[PDB]
Design a protein around this ligand. Structure first.
Ligand code: NOS
Ligand code: NOS
Ligand code: NOS
Ligand code: NOS
Ligand code: CL
Ligand code: CL
Lengths: 434, 434
């Protein structure tokens, strides 16, 4: 028997741009999409649960390809600074004061509540105290990628690059065989990681078959300083070190010349486009249309809540579409169908799981969300693809499933206690202002 | 006796950047802010109504300085086109088919429901069938500026420029002595209005003491074509015609050289910055920091729902702050306090009513909104100014007052029927797709 049959007014499949099924239903078995049928054929089938969603659009869950989830606890603490000043003089000192297992667990949980509330099903995270992020991920039920940050300087978490690596690998070993939990290696950035450390990461990632998650080409200063310090721009350096390959998720990728776009395409890396953070830190505009035209998977992330300051993937996807048009002065850059692809299927491609999630397709896992379009904000309900990108908001997501399992139903969180999340945030407000 | 005393956790006054009152209350009498006192002193005072808003921020209502409200009915019908193509081949033909009194009334009402829901208290509108916009404005209770559009070409509404003017003035005469309703003259744009029509508008606006509301310098094509057709860029032409003065609200103002920034400052015009529409139509980035540094009142508008596609002033204000930083590559451009000023006090300045609304100040009219910050999206609650701009969403506005009168309470609309609005939208969906 089917576990669930969910019928909706619209289904955006993301299998082909523009494809929207009307009055169809999704049958779910063993956590996967087992059938996609006219809703009329669905009552004749048996199911453990049945759900009718009139005036709702069903679509793949949104994939946040770049977050620092625990930074939810620092929301609004460090505005109006460019990247290096922001890290050096505000973020790193605050992180030195407050970041331990407790912070990371509490902050990750808070972030996950906010993400589920806005229709995010997968988070590609990157932080410290990775066992705490993993624990939070198993608790929330989100599809979770835990990025083990690697730096050269000592922190409360680890004393040197080898220690970040050893601790990440030790923590990874405590969460083996978890279908929805995946550890990655996350060397922080070209300007905080040495050639030797990058080589160790390449070797380890290859041996253990892990993704590499790294902030790359975020600022002009990073790129220009790299030439001075390493003799070439960061991408060329990383190519020399062996880092560019399909396992690499390159966050930001704001400052690129045309040769670097082709380099990315040839090595089959993916990028995470984080428009709010790129604007807020005054980093610049990633040439996402050029990357996508070259065949590169460009997903979308939010970055952390201290440089956004939302974890809202619908808002982030709209912003990607708007910024692409203003940056190219071409109104046909990133149409709504492409933006949805960025927020879903391209994220899955980046994470090496596009055969598993990212579209509404029989055989794929049921990572799905439903948006209630019967609100003034999305009225009249003409084209749901257009509305999802340009009009709908995080507040309209009504239901969230990961592998067929409900994480939210009629905006009630089913795996996390929303009151508990608010209380942890209030605790941290007191502790940080202390 | 006070009509209302509203106590809140935070009050953002907008009287000085950064000023936030904690645990204070606003006493309202005769539609105006009569006192701002510590909340402890408030129970000792008598009031017809008392309201406690723990974890809420109270602030001035948001002022949408540029809308085409009835276009709510066209939401998502015309994406991925640049301005002239969009108007010529999509918008104007659709407007020729569907726009009459009924469309404008229904569409304005729908827009007003969405605007109130997101904390907008004043709308500077610009459309056709102005008596219908006026009627909708009196119904909703919003502070409403009705912009009587003037074009040269015949439409269902009017046959020539003189007819747009005569009809607007006739309709204005039916709504005299309304405190919350103000008619303006709205010549459409430099490229749709002749020198003779502009002169008639200058003369009429002076005689009747009316504001002038006009789309100016929206695109590079407009500015370059003006030189060919009129011998000078549009602002210089309008200066020659007498249009630049404090009564002018110049919408868009995207393509400006430094001489035009100073011209604007010298004539004391204001601009409406409409970032989503400027990005979506691929028009460009208005140099709002330069204008503001020169002393020009720069407010924020949404434009119409077919080029946004939201009427969300919180989202529009965040976008203004983000776009300013990425466009100048200066993270200190448009800090959150300045963005709030743009969305409130600068709108009031533009509309010539900054002595009346736009800040929380004794003697001013009680155009106020309350946002519930006790949500995951704005947790932890550190600085409410930062959160309002970078984290809070339209869904968190709980209460709206215009002149002390509640237009929304705990997200229930008090002057409009939300079900009726949804039904009109559904009616129009059917009629437009027919
Ligand atoms: O946009 C960013 N660029 C570079 N570093 C960042 C950004 N956001 C957060 N972090 C920092 O990266 C570390 C986790 O890998 C943390 O120190 C976090 O504060
Ligand atoms: O555009 C794509 N379509 C399908 N799969 C893709 C695409 N790009 C990368 N992959 C990757 O190919 C493998 C088999 O599906 C998976 O690793 C998937 O992520
Ligand atoms: O961003 C814009 N620029 C120019 N015209 C516009 C824009 N948005 C809507 N209209 C058009 O202006 C008229 C009302 O004055 C309407 O025809 C409307 O469709
Ligand atoms: O920065 C300002 N502060 C106060 N009033 C202003 C400002 N700019 C323009 N006005 C205008 O001056 C008159 C008296 O207050 C009003 O017309 C108001 O809108
Ligand atoms: Cl080195
Ligand atoms: Cl002329």
């Amino acid at each position: 028997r089917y576990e669930k049959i969910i019928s909706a007014r619209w289904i955006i499949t993301v299998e082909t741009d523009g494809e929207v099924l009307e009055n169809h239903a999704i049958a779910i078995r063993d956590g996967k999409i087992a059938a996609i049928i006219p809703a009329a054929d669905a009552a004749g089938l048996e199911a453990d649960e049945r759900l009718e969603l009139p005036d709702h659009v069903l679509m793949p869950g949104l994939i946040n390809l770049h977050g620092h989830s625990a930074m939810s606890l620092l929301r609004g603490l460090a505005d109006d600074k460019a990247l290096m000043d922001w890290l050096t003089n505000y973020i790193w000192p605050t992180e030195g004061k407050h970041v331990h297992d407790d912070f990371v667990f509490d902050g990750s949980l808070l972030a996950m509540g906010e993400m589920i509330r806005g229709g995010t099903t997968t988070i590609n995270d990157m932080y410290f105290y990775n066992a705490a992020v993993a624990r939070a991920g198993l608790a929330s039920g989100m599809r979770t990628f835990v990025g083990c940050s690697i730096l050269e300087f000592p922190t409360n978490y680890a004393s040197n690059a080898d220690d970040y690596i050893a601790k990440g690998m030790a923590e990874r070993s405590q969460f083996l065989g978890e279908d929805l939990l995946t550890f990655t290696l996350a060397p922080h950035a070209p300007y905080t990681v040495s050639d030797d450390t990058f080589r160790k990461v390449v070797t380890l990632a290859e041996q253990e078959d892990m993704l590499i998650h790294c902030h790359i080409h975020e600022t002009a200063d990073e790129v220009n300083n790299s030439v001075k310090e390493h003799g070439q721009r960061p991408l060329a350096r990383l190519q020399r070190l062996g880092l560019l390959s399909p396992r690499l998720v390159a966050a930001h990728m704001v400052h690129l010349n045309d040769a670097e776009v082709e380099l990315a395409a040839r090595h089959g890396l993916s990028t995470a486009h984080n428009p709010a953070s790129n604007m807020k830190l005054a980093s610049g505009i990633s040439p996402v249309s050029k990357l996508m035209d070259a065949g590169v998977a460009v997903g979308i992330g939010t970055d952390g809540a201290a440089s956004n300051n939302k974890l809202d993937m619908l808002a982030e996807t709209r912003l990607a579409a708007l910024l692409a048009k203003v940056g190219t002065l071409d109104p046909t850059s990133v149409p709504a169908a492409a933006a949805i692809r960025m927020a879903t299927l391209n994220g899955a491609r980046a994470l090496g799981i596009a055969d598993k999630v990212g579209s509404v397709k029989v055989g794929k896992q049921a990572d799905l969300i439903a948006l209630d379009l019967a609100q003034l904000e999305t009225a009249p309900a003409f084209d749901p693809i257009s509305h999802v990108v340009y009009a709908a908001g995080r507040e309209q997501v009504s239901h969230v499933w990961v592998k067929g399992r409900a994480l939210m139903r009629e905006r009630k969180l089913t795996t996390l206690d929303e009151s508990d999340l608010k209380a942890r945030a209030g605790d941290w407000r007191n502790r940080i202002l202390a």
